[PDB]
Amino acid sequence: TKKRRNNGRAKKGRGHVQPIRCTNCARCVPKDKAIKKFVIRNIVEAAAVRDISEASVFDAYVLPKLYVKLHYCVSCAIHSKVVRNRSREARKDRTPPPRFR
Amino acid sequence: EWMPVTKLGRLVKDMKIKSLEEIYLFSLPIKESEIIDFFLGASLKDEVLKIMPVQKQTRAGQRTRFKAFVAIGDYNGHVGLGVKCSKEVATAIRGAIILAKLSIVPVRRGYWGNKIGKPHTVPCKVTGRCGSVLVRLIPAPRGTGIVSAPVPKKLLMMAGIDDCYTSARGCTATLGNFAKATFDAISKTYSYLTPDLWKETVFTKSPYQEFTDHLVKT
Amino acid sequence: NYVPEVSALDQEIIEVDPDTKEMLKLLDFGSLSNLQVTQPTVGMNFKTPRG
Amino acid sequence: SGALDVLQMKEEDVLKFLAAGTHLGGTNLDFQMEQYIYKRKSDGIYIINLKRTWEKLLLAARAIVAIENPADVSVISSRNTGQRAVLKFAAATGATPIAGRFTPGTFTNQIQAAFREPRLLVVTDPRADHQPLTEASYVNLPTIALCNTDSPLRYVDIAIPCNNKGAHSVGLMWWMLAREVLRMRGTISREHPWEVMPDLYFYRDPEEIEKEEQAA
Amino acid sequence: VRMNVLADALKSINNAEKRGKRQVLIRPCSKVIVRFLTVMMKHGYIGEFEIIDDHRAGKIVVNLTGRLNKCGVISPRFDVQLKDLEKWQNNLLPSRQFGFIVLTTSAGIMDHEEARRKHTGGKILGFFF
Amino acid sequence: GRMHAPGKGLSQSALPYRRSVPTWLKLTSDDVKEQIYKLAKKGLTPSQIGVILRDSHGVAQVRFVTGNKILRILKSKGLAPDLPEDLYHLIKKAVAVRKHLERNRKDKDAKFRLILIESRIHRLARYYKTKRVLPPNWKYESSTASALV
Amino acid sequence: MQNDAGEFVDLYVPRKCSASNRIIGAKDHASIQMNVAEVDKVTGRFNGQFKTYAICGAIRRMGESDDSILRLAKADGIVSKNF
RNA sequence: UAAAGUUGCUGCAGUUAAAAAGCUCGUAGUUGGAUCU
RNA sequence: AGAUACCGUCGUAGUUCCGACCAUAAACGAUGCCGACCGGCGAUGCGGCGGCGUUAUUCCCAUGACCCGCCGGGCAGCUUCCGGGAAACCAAAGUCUUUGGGUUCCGGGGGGAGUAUGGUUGCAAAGCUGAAACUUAAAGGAAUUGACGGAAGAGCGAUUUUUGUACACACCGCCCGU
Ligand SMILES: [Mg+2]
Ligand SMILES: [Mg+2]
Ligand SMILES: [Mg+2]
Ligand SMILES: [Mg+2]
Ligand SMILES: [Mg+2]
Ligand SMILES: [Mg+2]
Ligand SMILES: [Mg+2]
Ligand SMILES: [Mg+2]
Ligand SMILES: [Mg+2]
Ligand SMILES: [Mg+2]
Ligand SMILES: [Mg+2]
Ligand SMILES: [Mg+2]
Ligand SMILES: [Mg+2]
Ligand SMILES: [Mg+2]
Ligand SMILES: [Mg+2]
Ligand SMILES: [Mg+2]
Ligand SMILES: [Mg+2]
Ligand SMILES: [Mg+2]
Ligand SMILES: [Mg+2]
Ligand SMILES: [Mg+2]
Ligand SMILES: [Mg+2]
Ligand SMILES: [Mg+2]
Ligand SMILES: [Mg+2]
Ligand SMILES: [Mg+2]
Ligand SMILES: [Mg+2]
Ligand SMILES: [Mg+2]
Ligand SMILES: [Mg+2]
Ligand SMILES: [Mg+2]
Ligand SMILES: [Mg+2]
Ligand SMILES: [Zn+2]
């Protein structure tokens, strides 16, 4: 019984895809199958923003951002709840979740 | 006492439709069981083919229901089949009889060789499918009889076929699928375009269109 | 059953595109005086930007 | 119109169509709605041939008139834009209107209160009145639809290529269909314009109702 | 590669007949195909057809009447004696009241009944009913 | 599809229905034949001759004008190569691949392509032996191939 | 249809689709029998005569009943030739 | 022996029930486009 | 409890390159290749063709970047009562009792067993070909309702919070090897 038409990966018209290492557990997982996440955040948190803006020597100094690319295997993605199981009909929907308010 | 709830029933009760072939010509669905009783009447005989217990697993235990298979026919060109599931056997049998006489189709009968007298066999080879079951009917010479399994033979006799050869493939131990496949094969006899049906069709007034003024009154 | 005094369809001038005028002409209706031909939009950009 | 001069389209009808925008379609085209289209202009809008629209409307009127009992025709609208037009058409012609929701099993479940056995069905939109269309296939019911450039034609027998998005266009189409049916019946005449104007069939849009309420 | 032309033509005709089409285009043409279509048309199964003549192998446009249930080819072309014809009739035809087997004999391309009348055998090409 | 590739392309030429020489063409059959002879003496294969005639002199099809094909005209005149041009090109390509491969021992793809090319050469040589264009002792050998072309 | 004596032996003669010539069976509930009215060429009113078409459910499911009805009406002269 | 369309030429199967060679080339074998009254 | 495991510290062959062997993978789309026909829709990669209009090459064509289409091969996607199928699903897994386009390999209830033996290849490990005696009434596929979890009108038919199941005497289950 096939669960998915694409076999859970994004490989089409090619034979081999080089593996990467899970950020959490360092497992080898093919790059097309891995769960990718691009994280752009602030170096300083919300309270730290107000605590730092007063102690800075510059005027309206913009705090730098952190850019990180994260790769997860299926087990770590499910365990960390960045990915959840869906219904048989809801599996097909591949629209990203509505994070934009 | 019968009080029809549809236009067709009101027309039939008021003696506006002469035969069931008038209904069959326009492919009008039949929703009232009393129409078939009105037309075919006493010539209909039915037989229970199988009583099948089915079970649904629940928290307290299995829940059992009984499914009845009933075949009906007048042995003179019409045949029907019905399946009904209920808590009691008698209720399931009554429902199956009603559902079987609701879905009654006419049967076309032909000749094997020289066309002398009344038709006795199927017009040509006809195949019916249900699940994995495939049933094939082949014309047979006069006096041959029905060469088939016990289950198809009852339906073929009720349809009015005298002679026929039969082939079957698939899991025929499934009595419901075995009966439905041969019922489908029988039903396909009037839907086959033979060269003697090539004439252009002359249309006629529909019973709804013909008796609209009488329907407005009632 | 509210009815206005005048029809909203009644217009002294109705604007049409040249293609609509040609379609009317093919049906021998190019003599209408209420028609006014408007310049079509120069740029053909009617699709949502894929992304 | 079998090329008869009496049944030809007049200038006033063309002006009404142009004002209502019935000749304007969508950006998408159905592959079975392509014989009624004329040409795709810039901005992707498809233009509808009004002569074929008139021919289809006349064919639909001929189909409707052929039914003896006028009450055997059912006219159904689900969107709010067509409800008033359908009610006015039923009042002027004698058909049976279904405005708002269509209850499943109306044509099939014979023990329901609203069970009906119409001989003809007219709908405002195949994509919005799909439920009445589907139940027609169960009881041998012919169907007439007011289709658009992108509209499925399954179970649709007579398709009238109009614009069914705007309220003005829908009201005008229903008004013209009623007028043609009445003129073919031999009730009103073709020598003088009809007494009722096509604005009675338009959608009220309660914003317009509030605006007119405070006019005086 | 394409190794049988009559097979492709008959398969195309059958597929177009199932879909309710009014006309079929079959290419390439062949005089065997023309003879087969003539045999079919004499009995009223297809109707008139027109041969489009390009300078390479031709094409045919065939009108359809809706009377064709099945047209098929037999491969390989088996030799049929006049005493073995009834077995092929039983195997391939739906009834004894209609249907035809098409044979190529030394007299020409004909149906099985015409081959019985002329008392000759041949090779089976196909059937239609 | 291709004999030795999975590709299934459809690109080719489509000759017009009419076989009559166009009115504007002023050339006669003899002038076309003289042009063909001069081009052959210059050292051009029939394919190149046809390309040149099509591009420059407005000769769409020599067989339509002169009634004969380029190779048959050359054979009648006697200016025809000993072995056919397509086989010559196949052998030349095989020689080029074999010369490359001797300096690059680890190029397995070159070995695969050389096998394919030599298979095509064997097919064409057998066909030409069947038609007696080649003597029934002609053999393609890798050592002899350089001298052959 | 009939025996050697010529007597017709059938329950009924089914009607065929006007579009595809297929037989419309007794349980084909998606089939339609539609009438199109005829008008007088002088006045344009309802003559009282009509033309009957029958379409099977297979064509209707294909979405081809619109074109078939249009062509049938054109052939009978109901629809203008310059449609 | 039939039942066995469970040896299938008529007439079986090969995604998940038993099953298509890891891939390509290639001799023998099998098969082979129109056209001549 | 016990760890000869999972966890952590080191660490030998190996992991890297050259030359000779080995020919095995869930080497998978678990789906042989060639050819024909049979529904729509929107994208995408390569080549070509046509066409308003924005940009760069200071001007001009012309060539690049966009925009709107058409054709031909290619990797795929959505939809459909085309038709199939036990179903899951498949525009091929369709055009099959209305059974024949060409051709190659290959299966015949579950174990014994890919084991013994013979042959052959290899330095070895092993690769290819490949049984029988005997034993057994089922093993197995798809889907449904329950029970568990150290998880969050429509269907042939049973039948009509999500999810997994080899459980159904229903985890107090079933089951593997000494
Ligand atoms: Mg791999
Ligand atoms: Mg993934
Ligand atoms: Mg059994
Ligand atoms: Mg090859
Ligand atoms: Mg090329
Ligand atoms: Mg035996
Ligand atoms: Mg047998
Ligand atoms: Mg057989
Ligand atoms: Mg088997
Ligand atoms: Mg397997
Ligand atoms: Mg493979
Ligand atoms: Mg060979
Ligand atoms: Mg030949
Ligand atoms: Mg360790
Ligand atoms: Mg370490
Ligand atoms: Mg292996
Ligand atoms: Mg894989
Ligand atoms: Mg495999
Ligand atoms: Mg493309
Ligand atoms: Mg590319
Ligand atoms: Mg391009
Ligand atoms: Mg077969
Ligand atoms: Mg075994
Ligand atoms: Mg055993
Ligand atoms: Mg029920
Ligand atoms: Mg049911
Ligand atoms: Mg699991
Ligand atoms: Mg699983
Ligand atoms: Mg379960
Ligand atoms: Zn991980």
Side-chain angles (χ1 to χ4, degrees), chain D residues 44-89:
Chain D
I45 301 299
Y46 279 85
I47 303 176
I48 305 176
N49 191 316
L50 292 180
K51 184 175 185 56
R52 307 182 192 269
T53 307
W54 178 260
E55 294 290 340
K56 298 303 296 182
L57 196 150
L58 284 191
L59 184 59
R62 297 201 195 196
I64 293 179
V65 173
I67 297 190
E68 307 193 20
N69 181 21
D72 290 353
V73 185
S74 292
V75 277
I76 296 189
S77 182
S78 300
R79 296 160 49 188
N80 49 16
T81 60
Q83 296 186 20
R84 194 198 191 193
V86 165
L87 290 175
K88 295 301 165 57
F89 180 95

Side-chain angles (χ1 to χ4, degrees), chain G residues 4-79:
Chain G
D4 64 332
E7 307 175 3
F8 290 91
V9 278
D10 262 349
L11 278 175
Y12 79 111
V13 182
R15 73 196 196 280
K16 293 187 294 298
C17 182
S18 298
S20 62
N21 200 252
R22 299 173 180 171
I23 296 185
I24 299 176
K27 296 313 175 183
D28 193 359
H29 299 328
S31 177
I32 59 162
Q33 173 111 333
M34 189 161 53
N35 296 12
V36 182
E38 300 181 9
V39 305
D40 294 333
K41 60 185 187 63
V42 185
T43 60
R45 278 171 166 81
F46 177 50
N47 197 340
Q49 314 299 140
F50 47 80
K51 290 175 179 176
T52 307
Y53 304 139
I55 306 297
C56 72
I59 304 294
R60 276 169 51 88
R61 289 188 185 93
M62 292 184 182
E64 305 281 353
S65 54
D66 176 28
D67 200 311
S68 303
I69 289 297
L70 180 62
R71 291 187 295 102
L72 262 53
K74 285 176 54 59
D76 278 327
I78 297 178
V79 171

Side-chain angles (χ1 to χ4, degrees), chain D residues 91-107:
Chain D
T93 299
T96 309
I98 299 187
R101 172 189 167 81
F102 177 82
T103 299
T106 302
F107 298 154

Side-chain angles (χ1 to χ4, degrees), chain F residues 23-92:
Chain F
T23 309
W24 71 77
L25 184 61
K26 60 179 180 180
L27 294 184
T28 56
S29 309
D30 303 332
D31 199 357
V32 174
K33 286 193 177 184
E34 292 299 329
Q35 282 285 341
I36 295 177
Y37 298 151
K38 186 165 175 290
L39 290 179
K41 294 170 187 176
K42 211 188 306 177
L44 270 65
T45 56
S47 305
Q48 304 183 286
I49 299 174
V51 166
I52 289 293
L53 292 177
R54 203 227 307 110
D55 286 353
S56 300
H57 303 71
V59 181
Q61 277 286 325
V62 179
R63 185 169 54 89
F64 288 164
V65 178
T66 70
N68 197 23
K69 292 183 284 295
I70 311 291
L71 186 56
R72 285 179 174 175
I73 294 178
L74 265 52
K75 286 190 177 182
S76 297
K77 186 60 179 300
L79 309 175
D82 47 345
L83 73 166
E85 61 166 273
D86 49 8
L87 188 59
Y88 167 85
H89 285 298
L90 278 170
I91 298 177
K92 187 182 58 179

